[PDB]
Amino acid sequence: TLNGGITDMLTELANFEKNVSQAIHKYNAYRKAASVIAKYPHKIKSGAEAKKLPGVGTKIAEKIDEFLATGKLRKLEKIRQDDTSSSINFLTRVSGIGPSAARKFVDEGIKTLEDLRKNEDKLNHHQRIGLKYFGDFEKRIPREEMLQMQDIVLNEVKKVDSEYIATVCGSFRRGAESSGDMDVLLTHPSFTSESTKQPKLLHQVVEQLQKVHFITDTLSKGETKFMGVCQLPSKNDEKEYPHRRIDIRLIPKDQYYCGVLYFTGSDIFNKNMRAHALEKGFTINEYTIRPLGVTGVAGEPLPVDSEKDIFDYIQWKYREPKDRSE
Template sequence: MFARAIQLKRFDAPSSCTFSSYRRFSAFKSQNPANQGIVDFLMQHKDEEDRKAKPNWFKVHAYNSAILTVSKIDTPIRSGEDLHAIPGIGARITERINDYLYKQYAQSASQDDEAFQNATRVKAKALFSTIPGVGPAKTRQLVEAGCLSIESLLSNEFSSYLNPIQLLHAKYLRNGNWFNKRRDADNVLEFCRGSLGPGYELALVGEYRRGFDSFPAVHVIISHPDHVHVPLPTSPPLDTGIVKGRGKGLSLFPTQDRRRERWLSHPENIPETLLQSDIIPSLQRQYLIADPIQVSRTSWKGYILLPDENGNAGQSRQDRARAIEKKEGRFTTLIMQLVPQKSFASSLAFYTGDDMFNRYLRTSAQQQGMLFNEHGVWQWTANEKTPLPKPSNSSELPSSEADSDSTQSQSSITQANSADTANAVDTVDPVNATATANDVLARSTQSSPSSPAEDGYWALQPSATEEEIFELLKIAYVKPEDRIGPGNWGVVKKNWKRPVSAHSESGDTHDDVPT
């Protein structure tokens, strides 16, 4: 109701406008009769959005603003280029207006008409701009070179303008629009459940879980009893005053070691986990996976062939193999995240998003002296040689410190880390043992003797549900469909400052190399 009141306050109808209510226009005349079709077209789309059970009031307001702006233009609008410099009309609505004009010209005018050619160029620019990684400069370069369709873009004449990843995106763009419906995501989830063996737990996250009707990618998190390794945070304790990197503690994703990231960019260097040994091969055997885009130890992103309405029983494997080979049917982007069982609730909250809500969760954790990431809520636990509090009995110690005495020196703890990583039953599985040993070795060699890691460790707090995570952070639970920022779920204190401890006063530094 508040958003509706704001729109009513901002709505200024011209004298030529007569309407029965704010929601439904009965008549709206343009100052130039040549633009009346555009006004009627925008009114139709506004009414369609307005009649939905949960209308997007931002879209309704955008359409109202565009209707008012177009109605005041006294010159004929011949293509979307005529609207780029006019305030009050966004890029998406400009594309829709250009598509409308393109169809009108195609039905009534020859292709030699100048207006039709302008609309064709604008339509091509809008189409190429939807290809991930293709920016305005590349789009303009393609159109000026005479490339006006996806078929032309994939030809030998223009394919050299794009890199291999951009060409891969363009190849699947011609098979339909980028957006999926909720039913499409449900079909993908059921297909994956039917293709994987017992023991796997899957959940849809991202925009689907936030209640969106359409979204560009299907995002799934997967857990299994055999995948239990929980990576330890390597950030310094939040009370040290040490800030490494841009916006430390407030960014959505932790900063990664770039050298390790480059090394893992080669498929042959990726340590094998359940994702590589079981999940991906199982989905490939059922011909769900078409082309990979990005692969890491615990995540996979790529194109898949959407299952039909009957899930995995509606098509034979031969039919799906033929469709993938010939690029027939509907394809979409699938993102899979393999998460530890102990981290399923935190991964569910983290990957549901959105970005602004995750920032709210991470900052709320900082204000409680904790750390929140996709693996859980962490409490800094001090060793006995420091005046910081001892770990409580309710805290769950990470496996690398679980078998170590709290009075050991840092060198003893490092040796215990290396030994326990290979045989810790409740933390490391055989599939992840190699990767974990490498991670522990990297942390032990990159920590200086004076680093804050000597004084304690991060302890994972038990949290089996999202509600328990919110309780640990001392904030009210927010439903997934309400996690769309900016929202009324809470206010992050802008003047909150990180407390300063003896670590920062002594001038110690810490090489922050998150896992």
Template sequence: MAPGPLRRRKGPGGHADPPPVPCSPSSSSSSSLSCSSSSSSPRWSSGLTLYLVERRMGRSRRAFLSGLARAKGFRVDDAYSPAVTHVVMEHTSAAQAARWAQQQGGTQGGTQEGTQGGPPILLDITWFTDSMAAGRPVPVEGRHQLGEALETLAEAAALEGNEGRSLSFRRAASTLKALPGPLTRLSQLEGLPYCGAHSRGVIQEMLEDGASREADGVRQSDRFRAMKLFTQIFGVGVKTADGWYREGLRTLGDLRERGKKLTRMQEAGVRHYEDLKTPVELSDVEAVRRVVEEAVLQVLPGANITLTGGFRRGKRHGHDVDFLITHPEEGREAGILPNVMSCLESQGLVLYQHTQENHYCTPKAMAQPASRTNTMDAFERCFSILRVSRPSPGVASRGPPRDWKAVRVDLVVTPASQFPFALLGWTGSQHFERELRRFSRQERKLILNSHALYNPEKKTFLPAASEEEIFRHLGLEFIPPEERNA
């Protein structure tokens, strides 16, 4: 779901996931990759199917790359069909890719999840080469698509502490992805929200030249690279990263050599950096779910454990795993996290943990104006890094192969009465939540957060037993989790 108009109940139906458009072609070459003569059956149970477009790639190169992908376990179709989930192109601009998509019977670039039966993702060859190098499908990043220029500028602004500018670029990128068809002309953006002059200029340049000089300059800058690396460390924010950069630090090696004093969280982030920067996969999620459920139910029989975040939205990859914990009997859930973490620690599964007590006050306190202005997400929670077993050894790391991986896991405890609001808030995405709360405030004059829905005029709370009820209170058609990827 992109931050465009939200769907009112009994209004226009039919919502399409935002179709990304491929970015400019990359000069990246796959010539250094070797192909085994033996083939293997596809390993990807998610149903991922590739189709490599021969135009501009060439017949022989397409055949070589298709063989390479099959040897690594990918399913590759030689003919385009509705079963294709990922379309790979080379030396193709955004406008050319859009025209190609239109020629395939109206097929458009689809969501970043690319599922069978829905529109495929249109991708630059860089995604393919990244996946071949990793030996598995890598998450689709902005640099693999047209919106990457805007997202790069948004990220750069955020790393400079300019949240307003960052939000503007991210909203423009989301609007671009939410178009019902491929973008071929700037005039298609007329009347759409969040596309200011700066963003329109970047989009125009991408359409005409296949690249953004401003975004390219940002990506190549020493500061951007260093700030991005440092802020990817668990526990490091923009202010700390900026301080390190000003001190002349550029790499993790610099941190170690200078003997920088780190917090306990940052020390864990550096220690497990290689694992934590590796995408969390569905197999990791299931492994985490098993150990978390076992520990929670041992401490609190009858508790409910619910997966949230991007994986609830249907994503195949993520950066961490989030769970909501509640109990039908309100109050029994309070204070359980220390015991849950002790249970996990006794099994040697805890690499880092920081538990935060519930500091959510009473409904009366929530009604105060000062409280209603923030998100008020003050649940009991634990930020942790868990040691997760993997089915086979060889996790990418410095040192000998091992059969486990460090994974970021957030556990959040919520009372049953607040669970629907917590589920909605913690499912995301961030853009979806921001726009839903903006709509609540501006259009419905209601305050929505992860704890409740409040009517400040009547000074009353609107109870809800499900997410569907929250949408009904707002006069909106229910939007399922898989359509909330902004």
């Protein structure tokens, strides 16, 4: 929060470009600028000072000067007053509704929560669940609650098959005091990059979690990725806990390190790391790290026995999860 005003401004601009302008590259330019500035250990005094940082150019520098001088940005003031931009930005806050759908709904006259509620028939499955829990999905999850959730997921997975290994990743693994959702990486010896000796591995787990009433809804579900909703159980007479978003990713057991690096994030950290990889002649995904041939074609997966092995390949000093929050 040392430069909270500036990072908040840049994030708002990032969201505008992503949701309204549908300019993904500008969205990322703004997110990168905010990221590097949030990391800066000094209270910024000028746009010139900020321009010294990578990711901050002439345009953002000028904006930072206006913000420092007035405490606001005219470009944003106008955007906030524009009904169409405001309507679109809002609708995209519903899980399942992206920039395209938002603009389409606005075209149809659907611009508010009230509109959405009376037009459920016009929403697909995912969007319908997103609307249902709109308020809940806005709430943060205290780490204490993440711990209780972890306890349940690990114990329930254990009950299904003692050979499963469930790991909570995301901001939780990075040690955050609160998270926006729960991300679970799952492995089982029967599923490797060499073969799938058992079917329904992910299904079995989802089924068990629904059985004990932990998972309450499903946004999407496939052989390796589950995206849904969960809820901690409450005690007699006490108010129910808010529903929470949960993602479960089944990854080949032999590709655990690339998978846990990916699922631990942050998302910006992953982008920065993968981009650096490219510069070093390697490409990284949640399964492997491969060298790039003189032609630019990915080669065979390199041996990996720790997250650190991945960092070494790209000549980066190792960074613990708690230091990957970019």
